[PDB]
Amino acid sequence: VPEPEVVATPPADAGRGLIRVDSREIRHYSGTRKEPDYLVSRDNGKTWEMKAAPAGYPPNYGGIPKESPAIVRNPLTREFIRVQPIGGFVFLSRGGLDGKWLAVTNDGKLEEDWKDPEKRKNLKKLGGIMRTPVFVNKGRRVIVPFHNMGGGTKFHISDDGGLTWHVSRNGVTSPRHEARPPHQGVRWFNNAVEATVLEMKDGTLWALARTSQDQAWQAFSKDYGETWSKPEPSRFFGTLTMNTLGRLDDGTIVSLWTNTMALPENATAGNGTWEDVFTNRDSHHIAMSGDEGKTWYGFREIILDEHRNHPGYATLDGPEDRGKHQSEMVQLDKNRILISLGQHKNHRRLVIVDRRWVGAKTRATQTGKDLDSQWTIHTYIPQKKGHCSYNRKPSAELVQDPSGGTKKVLQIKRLDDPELVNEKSNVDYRNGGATWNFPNGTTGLVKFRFRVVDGEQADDSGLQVSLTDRLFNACDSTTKDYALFTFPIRLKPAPHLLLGMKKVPFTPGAWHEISLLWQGGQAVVSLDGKKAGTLKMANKSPNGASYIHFISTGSQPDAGILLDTVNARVK
Ligand SMILES: [Ca+2]
Ligand SMILES: [Cl-]
């Protein structure tokens, strides 16, 4: 069963503009300010080329150059509706995407002659930053989520195919972040923004929205979007990144999001009215549910950002926002889904994912072979660069296997690098680390092979090992406080595992295997095939474990430990 496959770079940041035309043709429109165009696949998503749009397709009067308008098919008429991410007009098609297009007027009529500037003055303009129109109530209503500068998500609502519009009575909100430890400042405040909506089988609507909390928040509507329930945390971890929900032909729900935890806010973060830095946008994830969201599986990494370790990350080809957050999906066939994801022309991708891969129960890795594609190891140079970015370094390096032979293995240690410190922001990212994804499970077995490096060690040198339910940065020493299960490997006074107050010795100069067998609220730890002790769950999870996280613990430069293989099996 195939791993995720990159097939192209979309012509706009992801999240809007991907649209199926027929059984073989799929398009991704653009935000171009010039003659409209689109990226097109004519082989159901495998290969792609740019094409100019025909003369009757409207230019982008609103929007912005890096974002396409949203294009959605009306399920009753099979025509299309188009809205921009911001500004511009409401366009409806007659005769398809390459047919005639009409703009909605303020008086509920349709305007054919929209290339006349004077006639554009009386066209309907929907306010706010908009996401994707969705058709609900047996196709008879269309809703467009939007947010303004402060009051949270609300919905533009039309009951006549988009000709006339009103606003929902309420929408979705979420609370402000508080500067409590480990935070030294406030996260940029987003009040339940950038919502995705799904119609559930019982007619209820589910809205899932981006927040300043550790997870997306959600609300539900029983009246097709007019009114919404009290907002609550969702099961999808992530902060200040976008969620997308969709449904496959057979009823299966798909959730796409960036399943990450940002580094704690530092001492120069503002009052929350603006963002200082993004440290959580270098991955994208997928989970699925076959039972209307009662249970979920997957939580797999679709892709890691190829540039994530780079010391020029923030400023290569301009300073604008980049990464793997934002996404849109189109099903290709029973087993395959096409996803557009990310921001910036060097980071944006179109990727094909297989559902059988989402449902897999095992994964294995060797650091020397798989570092580039599978391992998050970057630390940050904590100096603001570009638009809300930091440049990076790899925090851990491959070295020869001390035993001999051809394996390269990962050295995880406390770095001697003053560039990873910012005194005024009061942050220090010199502890190297590494983290790796596997399919989600509430029960599982993970095994890893490690060795103490033969050299000088500090008094607190070692490795904190954590099982987590989202991706924590390699250099984040607070991971243990949020982990499902966690324990330290200590190198001094002599090497040992610490399980509670139990010390379990092991030898230097030799490879060792540790296994973690978890079930419910307990994890059994084994060393070289012998039971070593049992760990109580530190944090409950709505989902289960889907990452193992390793971080050095030394406070002075040390030699650290080597990491070779990791294997996971879940049930
Ligand atoms: Ca911040
Ligand atoms: Cl943003």
Author numbering: 25 to 595
Provide the publication's sentences verbatim.
Sequences of Amuc_1547 and its close orthologues populate a separate and distant cluster in the GH33 phylogenetic tree. Based on this as well as structural and mechanistic difference to GH33 sialidases, described below, the enzyme encoded by Amuc_1547 (AmGH181) is proposed as the defining member of the CAZy family GH181. To explain the strict specificity, we determined three structures of AmGH181: in ligand free form, bound with the transition-state inhibitor DANA (N-Acetyl-2,3-dehydro-2-deoxyneuraminic acid), and bound to both the T-antigen disaccharide (GNB) and DANA, which provides a mimic for a transition state-like substrate complex. The structure comprises an N-terminal catalytic domain joint to a C-terminal CBM-like domain. An inserted B domain between β-strands 1 and 2 of the CBM-like domain acts as a bridge by packing onto the catalytic domain via an extensive interface. A long loop in propeller blade 2 forms a Ca2+-binding domain. The catalytic site comprises a shallow pocket, flanked by a positive electrostatic potential. The active site is open at one side of the β-propeller due to shorter loops as compared to GH33 enzymes. The Ca2+-binding domain, the B domain, and two large loops pack onto the β-propeller to give the enzyme a “sun-chair” architecture. Comparison of the ligand-free and the ligand-bound structures of AmGH181 revealed the flipping of a tryptophan (W298, 56.3 % conserved within GH181) in the ligand-bound structures. This conformational change positions W298 to stack onto the GalNAc unit of the T-antigen, thereby defining subsite +2.
The mucolytic human gut microbiota specialist Akkermansia muciniphila is proposed to boost mucin-secretion by the host, thereby being a key player in mucus turnover. Here, we describe the specificities of ten A. muciniphila glycoside hydrolases, which collectively remove all known sialyl and fucosyl mucin caps including those on double-sulfated epitopes.
